[PDB]
From a paper:
We have determined the structure of PLP-bound IscS at 2.05 Å resolution in a different crystal environment from that observed previously and have also found the Cys328IscS-containing loop extending away from the protein with its tip disordered. Therefore, IscS prefers an “open” conformation of the Cys328 loop, compatible with sulfur transfer to an acceptor. In contrast, the analogous loops in two other cysteine desulfurases, NifS and SufS, are shorter and prefer a closed conformation, with the active site cysteine residue located in proximity to PLP, compatible with loading of sulfur acquired from bound cysteine substrate. We postulate that the longer Cys328 loop found in IscS is essential for this enzyme to transfer sulfur to multiple acceptors. Easily recognizable electron density in our structures indicated the presence of the PLP cofactor as an internal aldimine covalently bound to Lys206, as previously observed. IscS is composed of two domains. Dimerization of IscS predominantly involves residues from the large domain.
The cysteine desulfurase IscS is a highly conserved master enzyme initiating sulfur transfer via persulfide to a range of acceptor proteins involved in Fe-S cluster assembly, tRNA modifications, and sulfur-containing cofactor biosynthesis. IscS is a highly conserved, widely distributed pyridoxal-5′-phosphate (PLP)-dependent enzyme, with 60% sequence identity between the enzyme from Escherichia coli and its human homolog, NFS1. It initiates intracellular sulfur trafficking, delivering the sulfur to several sulfur-accepting proteins such as IscU, ThiI, TusA, and MoaD/MoeB that commit the sulfur to different metabolic pathways, including iron-sulfur cluster assembly, thiamine and biotin synthesis, tRNA modifications, or molybdopterin biosynthesis. The small domain (residues 1–15 and 264–404) contains the critical active site cysteine Cys328.
Residue numbers in the entry:
A (entry chain B): -5 to 327, 333 to 393
B (entry chain A): 1 to 327, 333 to 398
Write the structure that this text describes.
């Protein structure tokens, strides 16, 4: 095959770390920057440079709200999903603290949630970190058992960024609503990938980013429910912008880019995620019959774009080196993935795990190249430990 | 020319096309779009290189080590981080903070939040010209004072504080000194290897770089420390977690590179225009300069006009994109200088920049002269002005 043979290397399989900006998004962004464009500050209320800028912000705010079934007034712009996570959890925790100081989250949450919760523990909040099941799913009966009268907040993400597992955010939402608990979802990896309708879903706070959906880095949003009303304390002060919730200049060009990505995503999501899901199954089929490999997560109920695989009887660092033709991630920090460790894998298996994440430039030929490279590489490397021979005995 | 004339560069500036050109290379599939935290592949390594180059360009303008530069989302974030970060870090030493009534709201609203948290804040009144009396700063400084925040250039009236002298007083007493340099960076010279400032805020969009990126300088010698306000992975050496927006960072870097080359020439040109503007309007009766021309940024002119209504003034000048600093409450900075509410209302900030010409200044002088004349012709207030304006207003 012509594509397969003239294959540009390394192959990008790390869309979960960041995505390339869609050419249409970039083109929109370019009109909101120079003296010839709409470069005004939306907060300049006294002249047309400002009004024009405010208008482009309101369009983008509607574009974002339309994807996720919210009212634009529920969308608070932030500098990214890290900030959204900080704002949601510290904002709600501080606002509702006289009602209770107990927070429940998952051990497999992104660090923006975990380190936030750890900071709140310093401040006197008490935090339950729930252990997931081996597949990454939180046991909903364990969640209910942890819920108390002084529980103010639960934070559990839609799609796990390391392993792609999908939590039942609707059921968790129902549990929280019935008890009067604020439910925050980190939807950074699910927005524009799985359907989200906040007019139906019982979620109070939701974090999104631009750069996991072909928008620019350094912009995000937090959805803050108007009905039934949830409040949060601003963490960023300076003029009470975004209805008191987040002060600072609105980076119009960034906001316009995010809105455009979310407009694109609503239109192209269903065809593209079907295509991606086909490609992920194609990848897993090719590699599942290598002996002693393990899928981390859920094949049928996972995100269409993430495949996290553990390879037994090989050494983690030489694995990444063997796969240098691919841009991938092991989740290493050398600490292995705290997420894999939470599922209960030993450190060495956790080290020799690879997240493959797919996106809109990913082809069938890249997948086939990947399959043959993984197969070759695992065979070659296992020929280097006696443990593999000492597996092929007992 | 083109109407309306942009004279609101202090609100935001247009991105320099050199800056935009660089940013465009760090975005799409055929450019450098990777995440610099992606440590295991070249998409990350090449993004990390661009960030390091940008960080070096920023540090070079201001006389710092790049390791002292912490990236943030803007000067609002840098201000919040510096003050809350230093106040929380040093709170066992004391809980007293001194700032100025005329600071940006990013400082003032931050200090008000810290008051809720049990900190004590002194807000110093400036002099009628906007300058802080250093004798009153000194009088306010105690054994339990941990932090002072006094901006370099005021965004509303352009007044320049003696940040070097303030820095000396703070260092001599073991007090942390934070400077909001959002309006001075790329306009006045800053050399942090000489200047005794511990924390310094800057932005990209006040010097022809993109909105939504900024930095905080955090001194490493003698070492200053702050508590992170943004958690999630301990990035920027623990001080600010989150993904590094590489195209934004590259734009800011490039804006700061350009500013180092072009600053001296451009600020001389702007000071000329600022002076040209003031000369043309100073011989209108009953107008007041807010600030101090001698201790004032080269690109800002803030003027109050007596005997006109503020709302009518700004509409009369619709040929200009300017600011009156209203919110309708008048400018809190002007109220802090001592002006009555009406005079504060009928004040205009003219801020100049890269595209401002002598033709635009001349048009502005004429427009202003004619407009004030017209306005004072309505209402017998101006007509009375003669009759012995009956006391107190
Ligand atoms: C990427 C990621 C974040 C951080 O997002 P930024 O916009 O880069 O700060 C938070 N949560 C999840 C699930 C993520 O994948
Ligand atoms: C504009 C400005 C800010 C706010 O900076 P952003 O980058 O827009 O958040 C803070 N301080 C001063 C003096 C400013 O003029």
């Amino acid at each position: 095959y012509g594509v397969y043979r003239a294959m540009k290397l390394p192959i990008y399989l790390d869309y979960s770390a960041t995505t390339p900006v869609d050419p249409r998004v970039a083109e929109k962004m370019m009109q909101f920057m120079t003296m010839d464009g709409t470069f005004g500050n939306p907060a300049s209320r006294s002249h047309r440079f400002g009004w024009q800028a405010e208008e482009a912000v309101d369009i983008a705010r509607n574009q974002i709200a339309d994807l996720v079934g919210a009212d634009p007034r529920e969308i608070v712009f932030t500098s990214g999903a890290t900030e959204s996570d900080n704002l949601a959890i510290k904002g709600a925790a501080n606002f509702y603290q006289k009602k209770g100081k107990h927070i429940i989250t998952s051990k497999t949450e992104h660090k923006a949630v975990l380190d936030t919760c750890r900071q709140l523990e310093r401040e006197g909040f008490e935090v339950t970190y729930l252990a997931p099941q081996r597949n990454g799913i939180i046991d909903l009966k364990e969640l209910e058992a942890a819920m108390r009268d002084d529980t103010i907040l639960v934070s559990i993400m839609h799609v796990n960024n390391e392993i792609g597992v999908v939590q039942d955010i609707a059921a968790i939402g129902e549990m929280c609503r019935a008890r009067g608990i604020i439910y925050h979802v980190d939807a950074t990896q699910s927005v524009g990938k799985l359907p989200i309708d906040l007019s139906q879903l019982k979620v109070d706070l939701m974090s999104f980013s631009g750069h996991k959906i072909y928008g620019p880095k350094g912009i995000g949003a937090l959805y803050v429910r108007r009905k039934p009303r949830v409040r949060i304390e601003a963490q960023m002060h300076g003029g009470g912008h975004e209805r008191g919730m987040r002060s600072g200049t609105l980076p119009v060009h960034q906001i316009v880019g995010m809105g455009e990505a979310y407009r694109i995503a609503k239109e192209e999501m269903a065809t593209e995620m079907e295509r991606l899901r086909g490609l992920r199954n194609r990848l897993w089929n090719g590699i599942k019959d290598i002996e002693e490999v393990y899928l981390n997560g859920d094949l049928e109920h996972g995100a269409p774009n993430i495949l996290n695989v553990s390879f037994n009887y090989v050494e983690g660092e030489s694995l990444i080196m063997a796969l240098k033709d691919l841009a991938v991630s092991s989740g290493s920090a050398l600490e292995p993935s705290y997420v894999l460790r939470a599922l209960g894998l030993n450190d060495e298996l956790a080290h020799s795990s690879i997240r493959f994440s797919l996106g809109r430039f990913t082809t069938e030929e890249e997948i086939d190249y990947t399959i043959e490279l993984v197969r070759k590489s695992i065979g070659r490397l296992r020929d280097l430990s006696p443990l593999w021979e000492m597996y092929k005995q007992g």
